[PDB]
Amino acid sequence: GRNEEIQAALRSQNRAALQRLLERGELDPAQRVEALVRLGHGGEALGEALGALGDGHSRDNREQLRRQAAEILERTPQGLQLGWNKRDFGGLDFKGPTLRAARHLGDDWYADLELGSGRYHGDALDSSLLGSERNARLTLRRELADGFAAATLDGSWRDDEDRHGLGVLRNWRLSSRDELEAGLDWHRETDETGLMRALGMRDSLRLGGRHTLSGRDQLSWSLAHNRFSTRQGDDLGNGEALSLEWAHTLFFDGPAWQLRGGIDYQRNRLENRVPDDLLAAHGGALALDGARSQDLLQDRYGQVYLGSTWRRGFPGALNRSRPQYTWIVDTLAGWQWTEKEFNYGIDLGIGMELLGDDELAFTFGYQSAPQGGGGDAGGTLGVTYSTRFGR
């Protein structure tokens, strides 16, 4: 037959056969979109999918087109988002508005702009010197035949000291079941501790991979070597970080139910003493008394956790991928053997479509033992309104 050969070409990843079938215009719209995804053109895939989802075509073509468009929008959303976020790191938080925009600037280039202002309200910080933090991050992602390459330009202008960082990432796909990722970081934002987030940068060389051990099981690992310095360019200590996670899916949707279990370990060689300029006494912004080097960066950190997630799409995402509303219930139980403390956390969220092709999302997060919190509980609070670019 002919349709049988088309299906065989689609299944076997015969790039030449897909190219021929696509040029000669003998594929259905869903088959065309599938071939476009297989051949590496994601933007043209999205365009052809969104331009064919109408009454003119037949049943199950509309279904496959809708599903493919939704999954592509999940991977590479197009739209604008306004929101306000509160992240408590434990005794220290960072509030402020955010603005995220993303779109395909051409068929093979994806742009992601994320602007955000904010302020630090923390007991251990002199927030007067740490004025309003204006953050702007541009990420140009180039799609490749066997993965993608991305370059990020993020900057954080502040009265204390401006930070200008650059990051390059290259993701490889060895097979449908294996992916590898290598990336270089230079003067980038941190999240290890609230103090490090507010007063620190990171130069890091990172390796990682994601492996599909079965249809419902995925294994993810990451190896990193990080160098930490203050925003003024004074060393805080280097180290290596290891992460490993196993995710088991019980239901893929309706709602999606996933169980995860993983282990995170970090070992760092801290400097003998924190730089004096950072201390509040010497015209610095570290209001913590004593200011032991562990507070900025822990020499040893470890945790093994089990988690369960129930979700309908992703509330707070740039594009809503489910009909008319989304929600997430994510729970994590952790055992920090380095701190002899059990970490419990829940992440809640809900989204709703207001005017059409949009989403007003509210997200809440709680975490009893944030890393570097020192016994103080962390959490997250956010509200976002997202609108989608597309027909």
């Binding site: 009454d55 809708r66 939704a70 489910r322 009909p323 008319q324 479509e353 092709d357």
Partner: protein, 154 residues
Amino acid sequence: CSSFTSESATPLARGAQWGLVPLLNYSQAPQAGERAEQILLSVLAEEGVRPRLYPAQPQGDLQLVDDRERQQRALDWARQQKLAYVVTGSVEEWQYKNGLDGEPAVGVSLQVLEPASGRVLWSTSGARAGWSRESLAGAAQKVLRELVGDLRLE
């Protein structure tokens, strides 16, 4: 999201001899007129109206598919039996949309005619884009309830 036309007509008598003529399926969903008629018989019964259904006839030819022909062939029937009122109408939309939400979209128009003269005494149109978690039959039932609900009966 729904839209309904509100009529400025005189209220119609509750206690009366009502008929029920088949509806016109101007939507491209097959058999949607019959589903609308069944849900309309149920919805009218909720308001104390029990119309007399038109007796069906054999269909052995392809020319007996025009809904207008059947509707006239039933209007004359209503004339013979001397009914006071005759409920009919048309189905404008009967489908799930093809967007991300895929909500049910129903559009139905309802008419009440005088069988002898054939004059239109009532005419209302209702449309609804329901919830993505709502069924098509449920959306049609809601639209028909609001159309029959606003019907002025005394």
